Amino acid sequence: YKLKEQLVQAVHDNQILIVIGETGSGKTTQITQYLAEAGYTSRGKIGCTQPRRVAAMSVAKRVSEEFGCCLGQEVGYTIRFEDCTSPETVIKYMTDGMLLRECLIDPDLTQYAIIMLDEAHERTIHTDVLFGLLKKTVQKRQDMKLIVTSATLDAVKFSQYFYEAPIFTIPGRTYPVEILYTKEPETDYLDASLITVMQIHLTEPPGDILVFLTGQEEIDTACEILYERMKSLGPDVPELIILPVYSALPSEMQTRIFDPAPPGSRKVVIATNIAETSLTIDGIYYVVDPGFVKQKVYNSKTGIDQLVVTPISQAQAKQRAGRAGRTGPGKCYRLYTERAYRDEMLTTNVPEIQRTNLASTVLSLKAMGINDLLSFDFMDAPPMETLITAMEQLYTLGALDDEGLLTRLGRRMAEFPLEPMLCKMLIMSVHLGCSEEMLTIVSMLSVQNVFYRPKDKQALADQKKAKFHQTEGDHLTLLAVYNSWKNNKFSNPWCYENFIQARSLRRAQDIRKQMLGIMDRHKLDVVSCGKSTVRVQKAICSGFFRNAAKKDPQEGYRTLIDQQVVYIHPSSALFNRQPEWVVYHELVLTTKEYMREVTTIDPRWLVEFAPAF
RNA sequence: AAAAAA
């Protein structure tokens, strides 16, 4: 259709068009086929963006199904390191991170004609960066159309930025959500959610419950606990289809959240912020929102940015509530006090760009000739402090000139879609003749669930993981795993025998192919160091010198820069072989401020590789 | 332990 007619006319008339309304099916599904019916596929590709990987491939499957064509043909997608397309692709669904990474290659995005954006979700640095490059390709490509979805409120900001583009309203029925607060604050959200989910299931009418947890480890612990609490009520109680949802989860398991449970069994979808996307699960009436999210927080006092558990903002709590009243009138179970919401919780979430390290961002820009640092019209302004903070970081790495211009190492690191810390040490391993092993170690660091350690066999998993522990350090331990995997002919029963995640190695093997490509393409020689593993140590140190730490004889370690006590993680290949000097990869903050993936170094390197100190 | 993305 009734307002389909209006959209296709306004899309032909206006170059940039903002859109306020529905999400997923109704938005990206409906919209895209209308333009397909208007013959824009003849002029070039339609590039649709999605916040999450799962949704990018889920709308992409939906559309190819509707369109009739095979998936990966006319309708294809692109997620992670997989290009599930063809030259026959005419409708390509991808993540904002993907289009950005493509625009870095072709800043005129000549492959496309129409660029659909799902930005009615959240604003990530990738989105902030993309929005900038697109503003330029709008002036650079008079022919190119650009639809951008925005949240009802958000809409004014997007219009103003995109040359005062029209804000097209898509109508529909909104359903009321009776919000209910915890009488008094809970001791632990995890358990409380399981108290809630149990109650809701047994007492309340039909409707699938939706829980917002922090991470996999927590969702895993929620589901098991929820299952044994369910099974305890015998065959009397009706079935609950406990559904875990987090990005490490296989697609068959991720997509089953969208599946409508039997007529008597109700389902609980225990997700991360994976499910905060226009990822519109049908038949949800209950939301169990504890008001917590795993996100990055940045301190200018020391350039590092790490994941904390900052509570979800009021603006977010309100959309989570909205996740109930979509199929029909819902109920939002806020696991906090009304006092919490109006006081303890922030009004609206701080944009990624301010709460994250901007070195991997400055490098991206200064690389592609954006040395100006003002010209790129920032939709979410980055504070000049953290900008010059990040600028300084690259000088020490050897990526920026004394004046602030580009360097050889800088331009060489710029060719990889990697963190400057990882970049320096992979570009350096070429100069240091340990590139074969550094390609291994970078790809292995990229994947996270490397080792299999179940709760039912905690001890056995440690004894199996122990066979790989290097006297050298955790980085070389990862190398030992991947190298003994190829040794044992990429055997799946070898992984089962050794307690190694065969999927996580298979994933890491692809990134290694994907990186060897950039390597071989830009003439970076790929060479081994064989038994001379000290070559690897030196090269790791070249990139992670900022992450140097020294053994405090009283307790743990002390940072070379902060001088804040940091401790080797309980898992570490060094956790008991702890040495005087080390370089850590990441920093997990839990019980203690644990150093993630540690390797031994000789302090005599914090000058051989970091004279800018 | 990595949230999300590459």
From Swiss-Prot:
Positions of the Helicase ATP-binding domain: 8-171
Name used for this protein in its record: ATP-dependent RNA helicase DHX8
Result for mutant: residue 27 to E: In GET; inhibition of pre-mRNA splicing and nuclear export of unspliced RNA
Subunit structure: Identified in the spliceosome C complex. Interacts with ARRB2; the interaction is detected in the nucleus upon OR1D2 stimulation. Interacts with SRRM2. Interacts with CACTIN.
Cellular component terms per the entry's GO annotation: catalytic step 2 spliceosome; cytosol; nuclear body; nucleoplasm; nucleus; spliceosomal complex; U2-type catalytic step 2 spliceosome
Keywords, alphabetical: ATP-binding, Helicase, Hydrolase, Isopeptide bond, mRNA processing, mRNA splicing, Nucleotide-binding, Nucleus, Phosphoprotein, Spliceosome, Ubl conjugation
Group of enzyme by EC: hydrolase
Residues of the full protein shown: 568 to 1180 of 1220
Residues engaged in binding ATP: 21-28
Catalytic activity of the protein: ATP + H2O = ADP + phosphate + H(+)
Tissue specificity annotation: Expressed in skin, cervix and nerve. Also expressed in the brain.
Record gene name: DHX8
GO molecular function annotation: ATP binding; ATP hydrolysis activity; ATP-dependent activity, acting on RNA; identical protein binding; RNA binding; RNA helicase activity
Domain description: The RS domain confers a nuclear localization signal, and appears to facilitate the interaction with the spliceosome.
Gene Ontology annotations of biological process type: mRNA splicing, via spliceosome; RNA processing; RNA splicing
Organism of provenance: Homo sapiens
Family: Belongs to the DEAD box helicase family. DEAH subfamily. DDX8/PRP22 sub-subfamily.
Enzyme Commission number: 3.6.4.13
Keyword Nucleotide-binding: yes
Subcellular location: Nucleus
